[PDB]
Design an enzyme around this catalytic site. Sequence first.
Site: not given
Ligand SMILES: CC(=O)N[C@@H]1[C@@H](O[C@@H]2O[C@H](C(=O)O)C[C@H](O)[C@H]2O)[C@H](O)[C@@H](CO)O[C@H]1O
Length: 742
Positions: A171, A221, A230
């Site tokens: 984050n 988390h 993450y």
């Molecule tokens: C790490 C995770 O679960 N993050 C989520 C997110 O998902 C991620 O999206 C990114 C991106 O660049 O948009 C890449 C990654 O591969 C993927 O896991 C998700 O889009 C958002 C909104 O639901 O929440 C995060 O927690």
Amino acid sequence: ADPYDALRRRWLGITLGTGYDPAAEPYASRLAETGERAREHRATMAPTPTSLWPGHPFDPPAGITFAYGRLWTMTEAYVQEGTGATGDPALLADILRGLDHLSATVYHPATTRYGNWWEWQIGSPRLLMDITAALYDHLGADRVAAACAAVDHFVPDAMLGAYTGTSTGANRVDLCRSVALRGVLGRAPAKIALARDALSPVFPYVTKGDGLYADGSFVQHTWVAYSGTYGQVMLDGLGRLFTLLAGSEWEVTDPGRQLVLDSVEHAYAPLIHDGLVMDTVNGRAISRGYLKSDDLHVMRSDHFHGQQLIAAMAVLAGGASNAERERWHARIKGWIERDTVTPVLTAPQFPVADLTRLHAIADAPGEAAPEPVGHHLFAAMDRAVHRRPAFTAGLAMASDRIAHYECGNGENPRGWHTGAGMLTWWANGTRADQYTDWFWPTVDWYRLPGTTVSTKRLADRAGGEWGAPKPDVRWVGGATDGEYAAVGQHLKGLGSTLEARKSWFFLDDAVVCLGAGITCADGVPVETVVDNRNLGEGGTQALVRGRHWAHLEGHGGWIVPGGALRTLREDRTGAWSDINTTSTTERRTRRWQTLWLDHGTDPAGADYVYTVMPGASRAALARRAADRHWLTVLANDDRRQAVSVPSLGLTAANFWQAGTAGPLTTTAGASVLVRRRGRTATLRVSEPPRTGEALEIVWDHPVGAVLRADETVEILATGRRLHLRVTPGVVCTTHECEVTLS
Ligand SMILES: CC(=O)N[C@@H]1[C@@H](O[C@@H]2O[C@H](C(=O)O)C[C@H](O)[C@H]2O)[C@H](O)[C@@H](CO)O[C@H]1O
């Protein structure tokens, strides 16, 4: 002027790629498809007070990020050659129209943020900054200022303050991405300096909470093992920013940066198997699959996540030493060669920049590296990885430090038992699609492989979200020599009165699995899942059974009492929408072979022993099941679980409290591995309760001299036996001693 323009150009190189031939495949098709998407987006774009595309309202805020995403596709079509829309002034007008609509109706400083913070502080602003960079000269000064002031409103300096809450780890890195670019685009050097400086707390190894640990673990988390998703986001962001800022006034100079480089092989590489990152470290993301908002329709899976991690490694490699780069590129060549499930070099989610980096590695001179044989015990996140010639395995546990599972945002509502001693595995040299091929949307979530569970029915999200449910236990961990390991979990079942001691001994071609003290008062049966294997659609793999074994064609087999073993082969149909509110509803059928032991209703001190031999032949299993010599179970109860394996010169023991097992004695809870090799032996000891109190170990074998000992090990006696006092610390390090035998 020029340093801000230089930074913007550098970012666009990173983002849109450089030094590829747009008429060569795979680039030509990928660019053409981006043009195809952009033209459909443009035609459907429909500005209203509450959306920019139909079906995608701005509340929930996912609709805002979704709109910026489509605008980025549109922008790629406009700026890149080969798209069919390169430099089209109509497309440009529509992009600016969308951007202006978002800035007027939702993404602006009068808005009080609602719903998921992530959409406003990470999803949307990174995309807005990318589009602003790419279109910079067409946007005019008022649009750029407007974009910068939106980012200042949703991600104010105070977010890159205190290293806490939503501003940690992956984050933090994502927040710095938008603030850095906001600084570049808005010519605000203080914002760039703040983004650089705010990365520093990401780097040091941590002993609690979020981050990288010394043992290679990665936690996010607070309580969730998370290297695979993450950790990839962190690596991705870090690689990009390191590359962006190098050579500038705001270059990242903190020496802790080196720890991030070290993590590539220490933390991440061990969890990648033939292209996939193990689901044990993918948290709630195991449930995503086909996402309703994914305009490329690419299935999320262990292979999908592994490929994203490989792409992040490729970017990071650019600022690494020659030696680091050479090693990482060989690993990456090997994962590229061996990934037959989702061929890396044409992965459909990769834009041309990632394609060009990966193709450069594939094309470079050098050998493709195999994954080394060995064991990695990631104690700080309660995970183990084992690699042998015949197989790869990943184990997931849970503890007072590490959540049973993560659910949240409508994802992974039934992952309750993913931390209950779940042993995942792959037979080496076969297609690595076990967990990839519609496993999660069809599996019985009451019968995950390796686990011991009460059969009590649980609510969706039982235990709470975001890693809230942790078992109330301390003794979870193990001892390893880097090759073999003793691993133990004091299990308390999620939402149940189940308690059990589970142990795993990872050996040269098998994992011996011991269970004891299995006790429950739920009033329903308790089971241990010997295995549960996805056979694919219409699978016809033969299950062959014997007196004290079972074998599954193409998979491997189990040594287990044949009259106790229960088996079911069935077809199960499901959709990703069953386990994720954001996923598509299409239903597919998979065939399963499920094997379990039933401990009855309300067991009191029930137990099991079984051995799994992944990748073994039917003849190998039959022989091993009939061989009385190869394994001795020295103890299996709620005080001690221990084995002897003479073919490895190995004695291994998980001591749940002080006591003795075979030739070993301890004064406290500990995990002990002894390996005899000719005229010498090595004793290794860890303390999984993590009290940090000294304890003594005695090994009943004549010992002549001590060849070496860690500074944590005092020798109290040699002669008829070896007597040691160990000061073990509080992170479940394995300590060693090497002695000459008499
Ligand atoms: C790490 C995770 O679960 N993050 C989520 C997110 O998902 C991620 O999206 C990114 C991106 O660049 O948009 C890449 C990654 O591969 C993927 O896991 C998700 O889009 C958002 C909104 O639901 O929440 C995060 O927690």
